[PDB]
Design a protein around this ligand. Sequence first.
Ligand SMILES: CCc1oc2ccccc2c1C(=O)c1cc(Br)c(O)c(Br)c1
Ligand SMILES: CCc1oc2ccccc2c1C(=O)c1cc(Br)c(O)c(Br)c1
Ligand SMILES: [Ca+2]
Lengths: 115, 115
Amino acid sequence: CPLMVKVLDAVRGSPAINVAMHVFRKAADDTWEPFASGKTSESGELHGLTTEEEFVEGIYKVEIDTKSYWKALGISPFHEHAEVVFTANDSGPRRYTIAALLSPYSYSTTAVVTN
Amino acid sequence: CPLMVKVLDAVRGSPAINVAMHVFRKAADDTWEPFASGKTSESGELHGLTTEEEFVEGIYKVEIDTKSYWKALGISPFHEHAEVVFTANDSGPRRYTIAALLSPYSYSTTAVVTN
Ligand SMILES: CCc1oc2ccccc2c1C(=O)c1cc(Br)c(O)c(Br)c1
Ligand SMILES: CCc1oc2ccccc2c1C(=O)c1cc(Br)c(O)c(Br)c1
Ligand SMILES: [Ca+2]
């Protein structure tokens, strides 16, 4: 699992379940092409997005549909979504966890990059 | 001042000075039209991006160039930028402060909306 995404809810103190997201890779045309997608599990985690062979260096964007998450709960959000844009670099072995912590008017994201 | 952006550095405990950012507005054809741009001052704040008449209803994106900020300090950060996308003024004019707190592998954004 070269890339995993985990989403947490700071209002309810729980995993953010059934959160949809799409992952894009930047194309030579400087356009965003779909690469992978899914919805978070009951643990708030989305595994199996890609494979080691498929996850090459480049610029990736994870677009998390936070607005639909807050709407299903009845809570009025600020953001249309949460975009996380980063460069994947293949110098030495690296596995990536992208995490997002969600509030209606705030979000935090961090990367946990391990060998 | 209907839209202000404040950026802080969580490594140094200081305002994030001279941080560039670009604001875009979603056009009718679903493309991002340039709206305004600027750099944070010595207080980490960017004022004067727009006016009440220019800042109409719509979907806006703030793209903060955190990568150039970190690289100028000798740090290789994870993210290409910190983006904030939100609907503005849908229930009438509001004043928006967009704040971002920056670390090399993490950022947070929040919005303070007043009427
Ligand atoms: C931006 C997402 C985020 O917000 C936080 C606030 C306090 C502490 C950790 C985090 C955090 C994480 O990165 C995080 C990452 C992993 Br992996 C976890 O298993 C758990 Br749990 C939390
Ligand atoms: C994501 C930006 C952010 O991160 C935080 C972490 C702890 C406390 C406040 C913040 C915070 C702010 O919103 C913030 C907003 C204003 Br306005 C400020 O003048 C100051 Br200073 C900080
Ligand atoms: Ca790789």
